[PDB]
Amino acid sequence: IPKDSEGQSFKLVDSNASTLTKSLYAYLQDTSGRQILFGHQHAVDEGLTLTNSGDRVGSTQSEVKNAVGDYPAIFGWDTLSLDGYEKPGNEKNSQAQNRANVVQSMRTVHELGGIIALSMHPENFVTGNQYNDTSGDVVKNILPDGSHHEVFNAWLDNIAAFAHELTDQSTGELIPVIFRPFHEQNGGWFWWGAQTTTASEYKALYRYTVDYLRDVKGVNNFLYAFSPNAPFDGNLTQYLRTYPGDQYVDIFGLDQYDNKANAGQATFLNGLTQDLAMISKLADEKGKIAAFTEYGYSPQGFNETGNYLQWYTAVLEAIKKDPNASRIAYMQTWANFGYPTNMFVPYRDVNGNLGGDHELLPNFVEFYEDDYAAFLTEASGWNLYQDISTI
Ligand SMILES: C[As](C)(=O)[O-]
């Protein structure tokens, strides 16, 4: 993985992005067309094979590691952790204690050499319910001229507090985070989605988030990912309907899951080649990065048995075969919270209590063994750009 981007300069959303943030951005540019980094949400604290207790703060156990012998390159968490709703947070902890827990777990992974991606599922600021309550006209309400504006700033304030605490203890360096505001916004299953929010309210919301964190709060350790939900039938207009603009996006992504009952089929794989080719061309002419920001067997995970057994390699093949699509920088699958709806990475039965290895394991091993699929050891060096310049 050659340091082609070393000594170069890049238009980042944050012209004042920190050394390791710039370095990560350069590396993502350089890996493009050479290898795709594999990511996993809750890579160190959710899995059937994990044996550590409680909130799992600073865990180095990993479903994927138990499965194939190395960690993913990219370690995912959500803002829900800061609020105590997902590990390593806990609703019985103080907010500051939850923020310490998240900082600790990400420190540990940084020390392993991993890259951090932070998704968000913010509460419904209007109703006090969660991301999935779409009522209340939330976005209009949390924008500068809305009545819930200050409650949303306060939430961003805790994100900012988190970001400034997230430093490497042995170097003093800020740990970079790939941050993804308000995803799958063309869908209508989140309160910021298109059934409840105008394209133009969305654009405003995305820009505000960036402007507030970067300029008001001084967060310098974020890269910004924009990720509508596929399929797009290769229609870029549908993809860009909510685009906040060149100055607000570092990474073009898309989210796409297959069908649980009948995965691995032509339609899905072809649409994936087509839509990844599309955002890769968009990234190219814009001088940005493209990524498969969420993918998985289905929105309800894979089956206990009777899966399409070639799934992992079939997905990687659909990407590899296309000169544009194969330039994506990473692809990340979801958290193994458990059956019936949250199994994404197959397990190796290392504790001897799951009734044997999962039927998808052999193909997940092949996917891992593909030279184009980069896990943690393949992604080392990401942090080694010294001389990368901004705007
Ligand atoms: C796992 As999701 C709520 O980011 O589709």
Side-chain angles (χ1 to χ4, degrees), residues 28-352:
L28 289 180
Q29 295 265 10
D30 289 352
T31 206
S32 293
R34 269 168 205 103
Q35 247 174 339
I36 305 157
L37 277 35
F38 175 70
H40 186 33
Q41 188 75 352
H42 286 283
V44 291
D45 55 26
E46 299 287 345
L48 293 191
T49 64
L50 299 200
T51 66
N52 49 358
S53 64
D55 302 323
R56 291 181 181 157
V57 183
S59 177
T60 59
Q61 290 188 215
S62 166
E63 197 97 300
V64 171
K65 188 190 169 54
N66 291 337
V68 300
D70 193 12
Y71 296 100
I74 293 169
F75 296 67
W77 276 274
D78 195 82
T79 56
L80 286 165
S81 294
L82 293 177
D83 292 294
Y85 299 97
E86 287 179 14
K87 295 187 184 52
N90 187 319
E91 307 190 55
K92 298 178 178 64
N93 292 335
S94 70
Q95 177 168 94
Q97 186 60 61
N98 285 332
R99 171 172 65 252
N101 284 5
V102 176
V103 162
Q104 188 47 250
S105 283
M106 295 174 173
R107 275 178 172 163
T108 298
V109 152
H110 181 252
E111 184 172 41
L112 293 172
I115 301 145
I116 311 306
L118 186 55
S119 64
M120 54 152 71
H121 285 80
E123 60 195 291
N124 185 313
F125 293 104
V126 172
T127 68
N129 303 312
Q130 296 198 298
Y131 59 89
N132 70 305
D133 177 1
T134 70
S135 62
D137 204 23
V138 184
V139 175
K140 175 199 276 78
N141 280 121
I142 63 171
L143 287 177
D145 281 289
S147 65
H148 289 65
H149 183 61
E150 294 295 349
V151 59
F152 178 44
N153 285 356
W155 183 65
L156 300 174
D157 284 346
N158 193 34
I159 311 292
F162 158 76
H164 287 281
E165 277 170 45
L166 195 74
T167 57
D168 185 329
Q169 294 161 300
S170 78
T171 70
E173 270 151 350
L174 284 175
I175 296 173
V177 176
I178 300 181
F179 189 62
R180 189 162 61 96
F182 308 100
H183 63 304
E184 306 175 2
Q185 349 57 281
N186 51 337
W189 47 88
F190 298 137
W191 57 250
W192 54 90
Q195 308 290 313
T196 57
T197 317
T198 63
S200 93
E201 290 176 331
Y202 181 91
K203 295 170 181 174
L205 173 69
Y206 197 111
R207 295 197 273 252
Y208 185 81
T209 307
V210 171
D211 288 343
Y212 187 85
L213 293 165
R214 192 196 36 214
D215 296 329
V216 179
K217 311 301 297 181
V219 175
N220 299 309
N221 61 151
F222 282 9
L223 294 177
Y224 295 91
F226 171 86
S227 66
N229 111 91
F232 303 105
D233 302 306
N235 188 310
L236 197 62
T237 285
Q238 190 175 320
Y239 184 86
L240 296 170
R241 175 188 67 84
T242 57
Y243 183 52
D246 302 332
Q247 312 83 8
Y248 290 93
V249 180
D250 289 313
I251 292 145
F252 294 111
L254 61 82
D255 288 7
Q256 174 80 280
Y257 291 83
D258 207 344
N259 181 266
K260 192 164 185 174
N262 183 49
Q265 306 309 106
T267 302
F268 179 78
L269 299 170
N270 293 345
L272 189 160
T273 310
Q274 167 192 44
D275 287 335
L276 297 167
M278 177 191 80
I279 58 167
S280 166
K281 297 175 161 202
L282 179 61
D284 169 63
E285 62 213 6
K286 303 284 190 179
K288 291 181 186 308
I289 297 155
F292 198 178
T293 48
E294 293 193 26
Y295 85 110
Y297 196 96
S298 87
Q300 305 90 35
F302 54 60
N303 302 276
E304 165 44 29
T305 62
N307 297 111
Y308 178 77
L309 302 182
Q310 293 283 124
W311 197 83
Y312 295 97
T313 57
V315 163
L316 181 57
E317 292 159 38
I319 298 165
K320 275 172 69 204
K321 78 194 279 209
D322 183 277
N324 293 116
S326 73
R327 297 191 52 82
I328 64 163
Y330 65 91
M331 57 198 289
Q332 182 172 324
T333 201
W334 216 241
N336 274 26
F337 296 115
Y339 291 115
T341 71
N342 289 294
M343 284 301 287
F344 296 97
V345 160
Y347 49 78
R348 186 172 303 269
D349 189 18
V350 295
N351 303 312

